[PDB]
Curated annotation (Swiss-Prot), chain A:
Organism: Homo sapiens
Family: Belongs to the mitochondrion-specific ribosomal protein mL51 family.
Secretion signal span: none
Compartment(s): Mitochondrion
Assembly description: Component of the mitochondrial large ribosomal subunit (mt-LSU). Mature mammalian 55S mitochondrial ribosomes consist of a small (28S) and a large (39S) subunit. The 28S small subunit contains a 12S ribosomal RNA (12S mt-rRNA) and 30 different proteins. The 39S large subunit contains a 16S rRNA (16S mt-rRNA), a copy of mitochondrial valine transfer RNA (mt-tRNA(Val)), which plays an integral structural role, and 52 different proteins. Interacts with OXA1L.
Name of this chain's protein: Large ribosomal subunit protein mL51
Taxonomic lineage from the root: Eukaryota, Metazoa, Chordata, Craniata, Vertebrata
Top-level taxonomic group: Eukaryota
Curated annotation (Swiss-Prot), chain B:
Species this protein is from: Homo sapiens (Human)
Subcellular location as annotated: Mitochondrion
Gene from which this protein is expressed: MRPL9
Signal peptide start and end residues: none
Name listed for the protein in its UniProt record: Large ribosomal subunit protein bL9m
Subunit structure: Component of the mitochondrial large ribosomal subunit (mt-LSU). Mature mammalian 55S mitochondrial ribosomes consist of a small (28S) and a large (39S) subunit. The 28S small subunit contains a 12S ribosomal RNA (12S mt-rRNA) and 30 different proteins. The 39S large subunit contains a 16S rRNA (16S mt-rRNA), a copy of mitochondrial valine transfer RNA (mt-tRNA(Val)), which plays an integral structural role, and 52 different proteins.
Taxonomic superkingdom: Eukaryota
Family listed: Belongs to the bacterial ribosomal protein bL9 family.
Parent-record interval covered: 53 to 147 of 267
Swiss-Prot record, chain C:
Name listed for the protein in its UniProt record: Large ribosomal subunit protein uL15m
Compartments, record wording: Mitochondrion
The species this protein was found in: Homo sapiens
Record's subunit section: Component of the mitochondrial large ribosomal subunit (mt-LSU). Mature mammalian 55S mitochondrial ribosomes consist of a small (28S) and a large (39S) subunit. The 28S small subunit contains a 12S ribosomal RNA (12S mt-rRNA) and 30 different proteins. The 39S large subunit contains a 16S rRNA (16S mt-rRNA), a copy of mitochondrial valine transfer RNA (mt-tRNA(Val)), which plays an integral structural role, and 52 different proteins.
Shown chain mapped onto the complete sequence: 100 to 148 of 296
Record-stated family: Belongs to the universal ribosomal protein uL15 family.
From Swiss-Prot, chain F:
Included range, full protein: 94 to 188 of 188
Name listed for the protein in its UniProt record: Large ribosomal subunit protein bL35m
Lineage: Eukaryota, Metazoa, Chordata, Craniata, Vertebrata
Organism: Homo sapiens
Gene Ontology biological process terms, A to Z: mitochondrial translation; translation
Known partners and oligomeric status: Component of the mitochondrial large ribosomal subunit (mt-LSU). Mature mammalian 55S mitochondrial ribosomes consist of a small (28S) and a large (39S) subunit. The 28S small subunit contains a 12S ribosomal RNA (12S mt-rRNA) and 30 different proteins. The 39S large subunit contains a 16S rRNA (16S mt-rRNA), a copy of mitochondrial valine transfer RNA (mt-tRNA(Val)), which plays an integral structural role, and 52 different proteins.
Top-rank taxon, per record: Eukaryota
Keyword line: Mitochondrion, Ribonucleoprotein, Ribosomal protein, Transit peptide
GO molecular function, one term: structural constituent of ribosome
UniProt GO cellular component terms: mitochondrial inner membrane; mitochondrial large ribosomal subunit; mitochondrial ribosome; mitochondrion
Location in or out of the cell: Mitochondrion
Family indicated by similarity: Belongs to the bacterial ribosomal protein bL35 family.
Amino acid sequence: NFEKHPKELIRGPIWLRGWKGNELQRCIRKRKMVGSRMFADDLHNLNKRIRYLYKHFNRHGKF
Amino acid sequence: TVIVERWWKVPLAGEGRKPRLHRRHRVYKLVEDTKHRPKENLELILTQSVENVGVRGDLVSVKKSLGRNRLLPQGLAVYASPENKKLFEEEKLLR
Amino acid sequence: RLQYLIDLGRVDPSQPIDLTQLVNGRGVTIQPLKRDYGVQLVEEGADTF
Amino acid sequence: PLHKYPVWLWKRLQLREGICSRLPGHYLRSLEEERTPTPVHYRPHGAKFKINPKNGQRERVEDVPIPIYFPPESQRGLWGGEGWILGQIYANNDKLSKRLKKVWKPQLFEREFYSEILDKKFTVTVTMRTLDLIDEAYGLDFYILKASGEDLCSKFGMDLKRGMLLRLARQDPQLHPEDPERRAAIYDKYKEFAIPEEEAEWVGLTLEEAIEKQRLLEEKDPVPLFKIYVAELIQQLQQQALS
Amino acid sequence: IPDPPKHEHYPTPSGWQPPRDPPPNLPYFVRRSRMHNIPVYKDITHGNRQMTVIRKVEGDIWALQKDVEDFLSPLLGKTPVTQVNEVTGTLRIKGYFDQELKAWLLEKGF
Amino acid sequence: LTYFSARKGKRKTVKAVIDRFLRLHCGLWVRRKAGYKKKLWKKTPARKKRLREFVFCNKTQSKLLDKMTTSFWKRRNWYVDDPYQKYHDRTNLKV
RNA sequence: GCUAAACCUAGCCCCAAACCCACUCCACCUUACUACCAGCAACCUUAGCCAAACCAUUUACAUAAAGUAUAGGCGAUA
RNA sequence: ACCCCUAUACCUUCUGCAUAAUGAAUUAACUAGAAAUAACUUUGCAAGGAGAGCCAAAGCUAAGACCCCCGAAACCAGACGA
RNA sequence: CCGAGCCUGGUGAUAGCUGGUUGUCCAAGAUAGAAUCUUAGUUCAACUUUAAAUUUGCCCACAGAACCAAAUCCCCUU
RNA sequence: UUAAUUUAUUAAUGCAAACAGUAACCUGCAUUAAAAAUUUCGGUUGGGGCGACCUCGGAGCAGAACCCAACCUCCGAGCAGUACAUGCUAAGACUUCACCAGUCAAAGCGAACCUCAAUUGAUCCA
Ligand SMILES: [Mg+2]
Ligand SMILES: [Mg+2]
Ligand SMILES: [Mg+2]
Ligand SMILES: [Mg+2]
Ligand SMILES: [Mg+2]
Ligand SMILES: [Mg+2]
Ligand SMILES: [Mg+2]
Ligand SMILES: [Mg+2]
Ligand SMILES: [Mg+2]
Ligand SMILES: [Mg+2]
Ligand SMILES: [Mg+2]
Ligand SMILES: [Mg+2]
């Protein structure tokens, strides 16, 4: 009787639970959902990744 | 005091949320100064006859400098607060 | 479209046809976001009604 | 890995955890308030909706404050709400011209102020804005009292306010003998305000200072265990006697 | 979804007609949709390629296909070119013959 | 043209295109001829007339424009009395 | 036949959950690891690479509304 | 097994390389195509589709399938050095 | 290794430049021009690939294509 | 640096703001300096430099449908003149090998009873 969606069955990291995403997109989600309570050394890394990823997608490849 | 209009528009963030700001929102454009304004005059009740500038008991509009650096410190006058106004009126009536 | 709906049972003409009823029937889907201001009645089935 | 609580909440947590919890309820409330101060260096968007140009359409209009900077000179004496503004200007106010940094300073002064509740003349760094405020509130004391803690803008001012509150509470002799009537009159001027004596002690304090005060209050010497033991023994004896 | 009311005279205005009882005995049968329409559809694969699809076919699809071919050969002057898929009881016929197909189906009594 | 945005992670529209062109639902792109509000004196009447017409974009151009915008600008919009409403859908095509 | 080869399990990664650490004695801001003598004190926009195919304004740092309204050498882009 | 006849290493870069153009002693292990709009495909349903919002003059939901690596001189922020 | 130190960070800086891009087999497959701080690049066109829909496509024969050579265009039959 | 854009720093001034009186020191806004600070240093080219050229049109090369280069050979243009229906619109075409720009134009409605080879320049902004 549609009490629960199958997406509520899945156990995982909170930022991607029933949410498919993309590399860059996933990073962004992580930064928003969790980043506040994230380890300084890792938050910085995440930010860097995001910076890189944007550059790679929005500029670097083909087509 | 300087009033500083903000160039570049803060992008408007919610009821209970701070709006994060950018190094271009840090750019301002000064609209006005509180200085370079028409000098206003302040109301005082005189506790003593002063020269021709005031009559005892009366409520006068003085130059602010004169109010702040002569009259008030020397007990020659008091602010136009509604509190003491009544008292002064009463005194006048009595007189 | 309206006629078709009537024929099919959904949207009862013995009751009033308000927007809500139409929506329930699922003749007219509308969406306030993307600024729809409701239904407009159109001439397309003028005769044969 | 991940933290339990975010980093912006750590300070809050700290309060709960230790000595800061032993601070009273009425004081921590002040710390927690942190309202929006009075606008000084910007004209506010008084109405929440305006209807802008370009398109005839109402839209929301929030007013985001200019950050402000108070250098530690301003903690020593009453400046207004105003402090140093740190910003950037476009050169001749065209955006296509160069952008260059700017510091806008308040016009400072040095002036005496007699305070009825304190019976003393305080030389103060006093901006024109402060003077104006004082005039508006009539008395300097009144201004000090009336001015909300965020609004007041100075440690010195806060201290003064606290002192005034204390005076109001205790009803201590400021004018000494031969002026009881005068004192009474003064008190009656400020029947408004006048918080309980215990609260007025804590008013206008930093966090660290408050903590220190708390520590001082509950320091003491450790009580001899021997005494306690003796007491216990006595109690036991009494019990025995009873039975 | 409600089953449609029993009208006085068929075919109803807006050219509707129910699936006639009893079922017409044949090698094939065509179910109707949710909405009680006879399921023949237009489709445009590329920008160019235009086709029609009968997709609720049941039993002997081959027979149905043959019948369709017989029907449509006099209009085109061809053998229509049909891709039947046996698994999902469907029939990709090349070119639009949608309305006509529907009419034919109605006549048959599905 | 920002294939993935910073915050939402969606594609963005180049708003130049939006400013300048009208996408019909059929996917024609309509444009005002360039040089149409300029140096009209020296121009012959015929030329002026030509320049005051709208024009349909080339296939390649259309494709470019489609890429440059998001699917929002390609939706069906049921305006009350937009003068272009009749051109959105296409009639009587054949290859 | 020498050189060599081979070999799982140290441990580690990513989650989840839960808010951590910190005086045996002695020493440790003087030249730290030093037993023992008369004067200071913290707060003050980030930038630039880079993108704009140069470069000066300018370039981000739950879901849906929405990449919408707006901004912008009205362009990059935001 | 040689002896006879046939036979201008490889990669890259080139209009064109046996070139006397680059690279590479050899073995071992490590070492470089990753992103959606729009298309196509096959399912599902179908004047509707979709587990709200979005799209819909045959559509819509679904999956599948395209978009590298190494390398400056540089610029700036904050430390450390006579 | 001072025309402006060294270290860390921004920094996987940036390179229209160079070098490199790793299983098998088959198939189709070559350089008209444009603009362009542009000719070491690019974006249109042209050629090229695939998947579609289609009706004509190439070879062409008489007629025909100003005045101030070779040929070509057009072009029914085939 | 006598290329451009800036002066936030220092410079004095000047006007405010503060002041006092009588019949200076600080902040805000202007000024020109000094000092600096961002910054860039177009292309074609029988190497580059120097010189010349860089947009448009007519003639030859290019002899007969178009098209066709060179720092090949030769002329020129960057306007005039007449109108003031150089009014509206509109089938159907051409097109400088793309796009943008250009060109021609039947009918109709309004009215009467264009010349010229080139004679020009997008967008945003004003
Ligand atoms: Mg919200
Ligand atoms: Mg750049
Ligand atoms: Mg450069
Ligand atoms: Mg070489
Ligand atoms: Mg650079
Ligand atoms: Mg020495
Ligand atoms: Mg690189
Ligand atoms: Mg082959
Ligand atoms: Mg050159
Ligand atoms: Mg030369
Ligand atoms: Mg052409
Ligand atoms: Mg005519």
